């Protein structure tokens, strides 16, 4: 796998620069979401959290412009 722990403090999507999603399978058990922010940090987000789901959709909509 590539993630261990996930941040528990929601943050504004405006800092999210890059997104990556890896589905569960033989490699791991839970789908992993890795976000690279404007400040260089890399965060792992739990897909089951509502705020994570909303942030992902907001970033996706912004990136489509």
């Amino acid at each position: 796998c590539q993630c261990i722990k996930t941040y528990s403090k929601p943050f504004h999507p405006k800092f999210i620069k890059e997104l990556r999603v890896i589905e569960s399978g033989p490699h791991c058990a839970n789908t992993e979401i890795i976000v690279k922010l404007s400040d260089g940090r890399e965060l792992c987000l739990d897909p089951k959290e509502n705020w994570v789901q909303r942030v992902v959709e907001k970033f996706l909509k912004r990136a489509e412009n």
Binding site: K17, E18, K36, S38, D39, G40
Partner: protein, 303 residues
């Protein structure tokens, strides 16, 4: 329900190596030390005695200061090459400003020295030669023009955090940064390569034409020195500008774009930057210590 397959539509991932890192560090350290020592010696020789301070002395003093500042900035650049820019935005701006100001100043001072020699030789007997006693004002104007031309680096630079690459002291001019960067590249290639190159070629060509026609016993050495200066300038700066123009053409799609060519261009850019950095070390030998006056001064000081 058929697998799409892959037909060259794949991400072009950059290639990273570590031997180049160690070699770059060694080369940068050697260049730093050599430039520091040479420029310090030139400054000491010129400033020790105020007798016989000619125009060439002022020009060489300004050139030595520019080269010394460039060399003094080099080490942080070497560290950045080693591990990307970790030093912050403010240092990125300040260091880039200093480096570009000194680069422009050095190039324009070489052009001014070429013009001075043209006036001193070709128009030796005419009344125009009297117009070369404005060294102080000309040098001040060159420094001011360099500071003006180095502003874009100060204004539009910061730390960029990418994914495939380590952080870089890059330019952030907005969503359309690539095009603005390509445009801003016009200044270094116009007031840094083309204009100084044309001025130097014209001046030194006419100087050589006048020297070849004279009957002095020292014509040969002066001609060889002029050829050496011109060839050194070309060897130092032509490859970097050629590769930069190739990159600019590749981005604009004038030339076809492929991963192989991108990797080759990156490698060539690194090699040519290393090659061009040698001017700070080669200027003191080419311009200052190839003259009898400076050698005699150096010998005298050590007494």
């Amino acid at each position: 329900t058929l697998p799409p397959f892959l037909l060259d539509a794949a991400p072009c991932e950059p290639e990273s190596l570590e031997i180049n890192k160690y070699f770059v560090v060694i080369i940068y350290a050697l260049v730093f030390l050599l430039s520091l020592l040479g420029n310090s010696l030139v400054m000491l020789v010129i400033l020790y005695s105020r007798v016989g301070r000619s125009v060439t002395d002022v020009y060489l003093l300004n050139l030595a200061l520019a080269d010394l500042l460039f060399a003094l900035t080099l080490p942080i650049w070497a560290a950045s090459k080693v591990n990307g820019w970790i030093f912050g935005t403010f240092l990125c701006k300040v260091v880039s400003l200093l480096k570009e100001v000194n680069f422009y100043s050095g190039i324009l001072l070489l052009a001014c020295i070429s013009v001075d020699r043209y006036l001193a030789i070709v128009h030796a007997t005419r009344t125009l030669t009297q117009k070369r006693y404005l060294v102080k004002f000309i040098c001040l104007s060159i420094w001011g023009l360099s500071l003006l031309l180095a502003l874009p680096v100060l204004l539009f630079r910061r730390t960029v955090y990418s994914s495939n690459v380590s952080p870089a002291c890059y330019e952030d001019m907005g969503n359309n940064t690539a095009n603005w960067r390509m445009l801003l590249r016009i200044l270094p290639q116009s007031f840094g390569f083309i204009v100084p190159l044309l001025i130097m070629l014209f001046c030194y060509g006419f100087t050589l034409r006048t020297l070849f026609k004279a009957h002095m016993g020292q014509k040969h050495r002066a001609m060889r020195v002029i050829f050496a200066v011109v060839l050194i300038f070309l060897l130092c700066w032509l490859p970097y500008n050629l590769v930069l123009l190739a990159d600019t053409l590749m981005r604009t799609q004038v030339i076809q774009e492929t991963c192989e060519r991108r990797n080759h261009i990156d490698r060539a850019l690194d090699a040519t930057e290393i090659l061009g950095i040698l001017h700070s070390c080669l200027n003191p030998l080419i311009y200052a210590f190839i003259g009898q006056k400076f050698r005699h001064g150096l010998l005298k000081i050590l007494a």
